[PDB]
Amino acid sequence: APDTSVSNKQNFSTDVIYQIFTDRFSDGNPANNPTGAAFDGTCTNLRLYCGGDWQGIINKINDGYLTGMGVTAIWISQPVENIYSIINYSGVNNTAYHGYWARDFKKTNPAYGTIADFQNLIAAAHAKNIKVIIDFAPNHTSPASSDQPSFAENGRLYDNGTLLGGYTNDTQNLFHHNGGTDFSTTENGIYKNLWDLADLNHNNSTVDVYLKDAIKMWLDLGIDGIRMDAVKHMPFGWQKSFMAAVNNYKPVFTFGEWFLGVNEVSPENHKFANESGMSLLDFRFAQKVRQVFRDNTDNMYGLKAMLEGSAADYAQVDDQVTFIDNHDMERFHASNANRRKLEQALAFTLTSRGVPAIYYGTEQYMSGGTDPDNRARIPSFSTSTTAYQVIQKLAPLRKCNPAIAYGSTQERWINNDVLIYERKFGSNVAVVAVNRNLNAPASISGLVTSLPQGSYNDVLGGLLNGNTLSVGSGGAASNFTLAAGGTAVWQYTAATATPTIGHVGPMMAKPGVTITIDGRGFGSSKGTVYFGTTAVSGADITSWEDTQIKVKIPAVAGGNYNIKVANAAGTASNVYDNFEVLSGDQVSVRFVVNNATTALGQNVYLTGSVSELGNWDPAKAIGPMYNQVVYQYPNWYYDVSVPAGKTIEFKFLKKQGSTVTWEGGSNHTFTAPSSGTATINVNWQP
Numbered sequence: 001a002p003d004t005s006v007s008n009k010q011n012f013s014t015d016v017i018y019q020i021f022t023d024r025f026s027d028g029n030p031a032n033n034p035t036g037a038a039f040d041g042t043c044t045n046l047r048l049y050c051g052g053d054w055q056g057i058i059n060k061i062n063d064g065y066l067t068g069m070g071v072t073a074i075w076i077s078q079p080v081e082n083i084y085s086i087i088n089y090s091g092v093n094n095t096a097y098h099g100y101w102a103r104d105f106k107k108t109n110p111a112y113g114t115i116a117d118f119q120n121l122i123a124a125a126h127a128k129n130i131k132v133i134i135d136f137a138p139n140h141t142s143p144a145s146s147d148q149p150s151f152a153e154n155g156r157l158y159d160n161g162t163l164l165g166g167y168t169n170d171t172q173n174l175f176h177h178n179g180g181t182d183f184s185t186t187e188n189g190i191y192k193n194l195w196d197l198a199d200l201n202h203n204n205s206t207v208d209v210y211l212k213d214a215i216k217m218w219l220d221l222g223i224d225g226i227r228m229d230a231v232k233h234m235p236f237g238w239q240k241s242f243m244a245a246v247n248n249y250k251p252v253f254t255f256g257e258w259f260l261g262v263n264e265v266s267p268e269n270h271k272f273a274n275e276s277g278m279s280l281l282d283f284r285f286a287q288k289v290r291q292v293f294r295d296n297t298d299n300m301y302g303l304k305a306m307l308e309g310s311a312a313d314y315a316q317v318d319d320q321v322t323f324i325d326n327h328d329m330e331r332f333h334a335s336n337a338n339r340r341k342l343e344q345a346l347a348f349t350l351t352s353r354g355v356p357a358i359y360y361g362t363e364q365y366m367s368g369g370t371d372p373d374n375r376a377r378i379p380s381f382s383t384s385t386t387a388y389q390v391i392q393k394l395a396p397l398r399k400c401n402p403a404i405a406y407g408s409t410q411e412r413w414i415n416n417d418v419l420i421y422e423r424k425f426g427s428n429v430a431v432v433a434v435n436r437n438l439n440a441p442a443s444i445s446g447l448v449t450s451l452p453q454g455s456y457n458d459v460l461g462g463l464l465n466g467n468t469l470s471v472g473s474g475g476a477a478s479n480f481t482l483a484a485g486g487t488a489v490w491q492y493t494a495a496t497a498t499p500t501i502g503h504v505g506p507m508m509a510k511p512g513v514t515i516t517i518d519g520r521g522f523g524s525s526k527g528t529v530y531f532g533t534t535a536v537s538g539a540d541i542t543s544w545e546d547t548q549i550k551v552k553i554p555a556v557a558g559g560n561y562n563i564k565v566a567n568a569a570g571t572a573s574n575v576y577d578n579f580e581v582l583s584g585d586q587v588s589v590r591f592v593v594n595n596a597t598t599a600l601g602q603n604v605y606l607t608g609s610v611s612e613l614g615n616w617d618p619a620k621a622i623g624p625m626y627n628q629v630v631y632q633y634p635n636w637y638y639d640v641s642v643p644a645g646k647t648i649e650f651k652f653l654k655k656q657g658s659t660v661t662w663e664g665g666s667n668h669t670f671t672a673p674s675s676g677t678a679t680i681n682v683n684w685q686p
């Protein structure tokens with residue numbers, strides 16, 4: 001199959017994701033609606049169940065609403081079983097309508113539907129070329145009170161109907177009993193509870209194994225992707241070990257939520273995206289898009305900088321999921337605002353690098369403050385709006401113009417209010433002009449592009465006041481006036497003669513796993529795939545087409561590799577980097593070193609004998625380790641993903657900048673568990 005096929009569970013870059021709050025979309029089956037006090041069929045009370053379900057979704061798929069828009073993937077609420085208690089939060093009654101209050105990850109939330117409902121969901125979707133994504137929220141269970149066990153469901157956790165345990169009398173230590181986080185530090189928000197939610201302890205093997213098993217079911221259920229909740233609140237290492245579980249089994253595109261505020265740029269965030277095994281919701285993109293197009297607290301120069309920066313910061317920028325709003329922010333559209341802004345931001349998003357996500361109702365111009373005001377019921381399924389039409393015209397380009405899906409981004413023209421950018425991939429080009437100024441047109445002269453000589457009609461057909469463009473030789477455009485609030489898309493497509501890799505997934509796996517290589521110009525005859533200098537040909541290459549190749553990772557040493565491909569003629573492609581070859585299956589192991597005192601600005605790190613531990617390369621040591629919560633300085637700790645059942649030699653180090661100090665003595669040693677977790681505790685050797 002081609003890269004664009006619905007069967008591509010590894011690449012979403014050519015897709016357009018439609019984010020749905022199940023409960024708030026469409027009540028296809030009233031029979032499964034909660035009753036009594038948990039229910040409000042008028043959906044006036046935004047904290048109760050309104051009745052939205054899977055059947056409703058299926059109906060919307062079948063009646064052309066989503067397909068009509070050009071949407072090719074839907075992202076739905078966490079489908080596992082939620083607690084049934086109604087929680088009164090100081091007068092206000094609250095239900096688990098959101099799906100974030102898990103009780104059993106092996107069962108469905110019956111308000112949404114049955115396993116059978118879910119299966120039909122996957123079927124209808126698939127039938128219409130739509131991929132399915134779910135929210136998965138393994139950080140916690142539900143709201144608990146350790147000394148008020150009668151509160152809610154005490155954060156109880158079941159394994160397919162079997163009671164594993166509760167928040168009160170947690171002798172098994174399923175949960176954390178460290179208090180509530182003040183979000184003050186990263187360590188702090190990982191090992192404490194989030195508000196009153198029962199924090200799962202991933203270091204407890206039961207918990208560990210349980211979630212790894214739970215996700216496999218859903219995987220087996222046919223899901224196309226995972227959206228991880230609160231990744232900034234779980235252990236990094238655990239999460240990676242979790243990723244390996246998915247990839248080593250049945251890989252699917254996974255992306256996590258790691259909130260960024262305005263003007264926030266976190267290096268922790270980049271590292272996680274680059275090394276975890278998953279990608280993230282592009283908060284940096286969102287925040288900036290809003291500042292520029294919505295709040296007007298930043299200009300084009302600001303957008304441009306986000307674009308160039310993020311391309312540098314993320315090893316796989318094309319894997320970040322962009323959006324203009326979601327369930328955690330106010331709805332982009334403000335009641336009294338010019339709709340053009342929302343239209344422009346959509347256009348921008350749809351034509352920019354990443355995996356675009358559309359918050360349900362956007363195309364309907366829904367307004368609404370923060371939770372739960374941004375979660376109202378979709379008021380109508382009209383395809384007549386301008387936003388509906390914009391998506392309709394643009395979404396499909398991601399499938400037909402790889403410049404949009406995989407191309408680089410380049411600023412061609414810029415001022416405070418205007419932004420002209422080029423997307424390029426192979427023989428494909430896309431040119432987008434945006435004029436944020438809703439009151440002033442702009443004189444555009446000097447625009448130079450990669451488009452072939454000729455005239456180009458606005459892909460939006462002038463819907464947002466775009467115009468035609470005239471490209472002379474040398475790709476220089478002749479002067480034109482860009483309308484106030486103007487938006488235009490111009491493009492050029494053509495066959496790519498040379499093999500060009502546009503994407504790879506998964507990005508981390510053990511040998512023997514099949515990965516997917518997307519792009520163009522691979523030709524029809526099997527060529528060769530290189531992993532570093534290692535050549536792979538013949539049988540291990542399970543499939544080869546012009547746009548997609550499927551190959552098994554060779555049994556090479558755990559490490560980071562560069563991928564490249566050669567066609568049957570020996571022509572090589574561009575390199576795709578940062579691919580991680582796991583040492584084998586992984587386990588999450590907690591390392592603890594005692595009495596590792598440091599000076600200010602000096603941190604302890606971990607290194608060792610496997611690629612998972614950086615192979616003795618200080619520049620690749622794990623850390624800095626933690627020293628507040630679970631263990632107190634001068635005792636440091638850290639949760640790490642390691643090859644399972646392997647005997648590993650390790651050492652700790654103190655780093656300051658790039659200056660390193662090694663632990664004295666001989667290597668510490670240990671053997672990783674075959675499964676579940678473990679805790680190694682040692683003393684720093686001077």
Ligand SMILES: OC[C@H]1O[C@H](O[C@H]2[C@H](O)[C@@H](O)[C@@H](O)O[C@@H]2CO)[C@H](O)[C@@H](O)[C@@H]1O
Nearest residue numbers: 411412413414415416444445446447448
């Ligand atoms: O001429 C090529 C030139 O085009 C763009 O420069 C624009 C500039 O952004 C506008 O603000 C205005 O000054 O017109 C210039 C064209 O004369 C590119 O931004 C620039 O890098 C490139 O050299």
Ligand SMILES: OC[C@H]1O[C@H](O[C@H]2[C@H](O)[C@@H](O)[C@@H](O)O[C@@H]2CO)[C@H](O)[C@@H](O)[C@@H]1O
Nearest residue numbers: 597598599600601602603626627628633
């Ligand atoms: O919270 C982690 C913190 O640990 C390290 O600082 C030590 C410092 O070296 C000691 O002299 C002592 O005063 O306690 C500190 C930990 O609270 C790192 O130096 C620091 O950058 C890091 O954040």
Ligand SMILES: OC[C@H]1O[C@H](O[C@H]2[C@H](O)[C@@H](O)[C@@H](O)O[C@@H]2CO)[C@H](O)[C@@H](O)[C@@H]1O
Nearest residue numbers: 615616617649651662663664665666667
């Ligand atoms: O370079 C690989 C080498 O790294 C580590 O050796 C350290 C040693 O432990 C330190 O005390 C200090 O002398 O720096 C050496 C770095 O060359 C591992 O201990 C060793 O096994 C490994 O081969």
Ligand SMILES: [Ca+2]
Nearest residue numbers: 029030033051
């Ligand atoms: Ca229902």
Ligand SMILES: [Ca+2]
Nearest residue numbers: 190199233234
């Ligand atoms: Ca946590």
